Please model this.
Amino acid sequence: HHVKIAIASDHAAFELKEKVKNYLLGKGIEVEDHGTYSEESVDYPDYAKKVVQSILSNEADFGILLCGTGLGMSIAANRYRGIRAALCLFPDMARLARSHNNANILVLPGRLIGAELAFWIVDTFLSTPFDGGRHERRIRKIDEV
Amino acid sequence: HHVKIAIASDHAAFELKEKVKNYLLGKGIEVEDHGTYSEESVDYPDYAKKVVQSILSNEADFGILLCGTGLGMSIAANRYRGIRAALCLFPDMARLARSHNNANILVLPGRLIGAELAFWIVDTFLSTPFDGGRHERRIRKIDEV
Amino acid sequence: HHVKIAIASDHAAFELKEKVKNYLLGKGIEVEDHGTYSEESVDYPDYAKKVVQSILSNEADFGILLCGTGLGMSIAANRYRGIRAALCLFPDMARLARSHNNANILVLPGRLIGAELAFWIVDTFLSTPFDGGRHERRIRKIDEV
Amino acid sequence: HHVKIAIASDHAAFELKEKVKNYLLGKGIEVEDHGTYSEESVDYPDYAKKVVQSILSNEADFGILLCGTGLGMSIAANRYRGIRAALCLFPDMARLARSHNNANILVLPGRLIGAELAFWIVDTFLSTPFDGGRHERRIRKIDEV
Model:
């Protein structure tokens, strides 16, 4: 449980964000919730930036970003060198995001998946090591922009 | 059929890339294939950059990028301002990628989905307009990095 | 809105069942809720049978069955000749379930999908006609046991 | 590798059926291929029955059935008492199909999923034990028709 998560969502994925946060808190995982804090309409990139800043500053180990489909977050967060944000719809995607892409942000679709599936994806994401190997060159090439 | 597509993949998604290319060619859609041109091992970011350059230079209207899971491509392509690359696993995701995110690159997982599903995703992506509206602010915010 | 739905779930998919029911009711669609009526533990086949009976007696036009993954319901309901229960995880599956399989029961996974995705699947299921054609022989063969 | 699989598909899922068969054969798993043996048009229920008969006669340990979407096979095979055929689109579904439903037939969508994903689903299906417990009552209730 000694892993620190920075989490954020827009209004469309607020409900799932809350469930994921509470799931983590229930395991004694340290969670910083960057919002949003209601279902009033907000813009996803504002929230991507808060989690990004926390990862780039080494203030959290992993990020979790959520919007309706995950697409907006997957686009906004990956604007930043050093960020590898992975939109995962089932656990094997999270496994590979970690194993192959050394992903540091998990992106979830708040209107598309169920909470219990989200929890399995989160557990896989947080418990899978990076394989290194031939993947390392590829991850470095992402940031050779 | 007057739409121009720039397509690329790594070796893991070469087979699906070829099928998608041929599907497009069979409809009389202009396709520029940036490679890779075999199953010999290559690095996905090298191929993301070729499609990106083509979109940013207004040499193609839409990009299609493929790797094993789509994750590497979704990360690498979204490093670039002006690029909105959307990892879509089923047609409604492509619909929303266009409607809400004005996506200009479709990312597909070459080992995860079937060809006929990929074709439906592609058809949806290429035939859905951007809604504009309140989405426009969000897409602009992505590039306010 | 002149379509009558018989719906049921076990305890694991109670929450989604309620959301789907209320979604339908909000469109003025007639819904008969066969339960379950809480999250206390129950057995999915008991609920499959209630919706099945309603379809076979021509008391409802379509059924909707839900459990955690959809698997139990897809197995239990398809024990009955005349029932074509289709486990659909995204809208194109519901489209084909109707177009090709003339499905009369939609099965949804209550822990795996999000409510808004479920609503799109339901809308597709209820609004897609059967194509007939060469599919008719296949549907008849299902019941030649 | 001492597990015997009976496999069958219609024409729409012939390609994936062949890949799955060869994957199994490459691990030294005994596979009986009930067809179909080309892409000429056939009717899925004819093939469901062949695998079903093999499972009910204790001539194979597990079945694998494939059609375009999996829906036809999931309906046709589950007509038979003693058969628990599970349409699985990702590995966790196969895990639960085994753990909770003691599934004896895996159903795969031949046009919807990629081969490497199918292989992961198959590996999970064949390597997961039934949990028993409170699931046993439910599986018995399926056959109390």
About this structure: The CA atoms of residues 68 and 111 of chain D lie 5 Å apart.
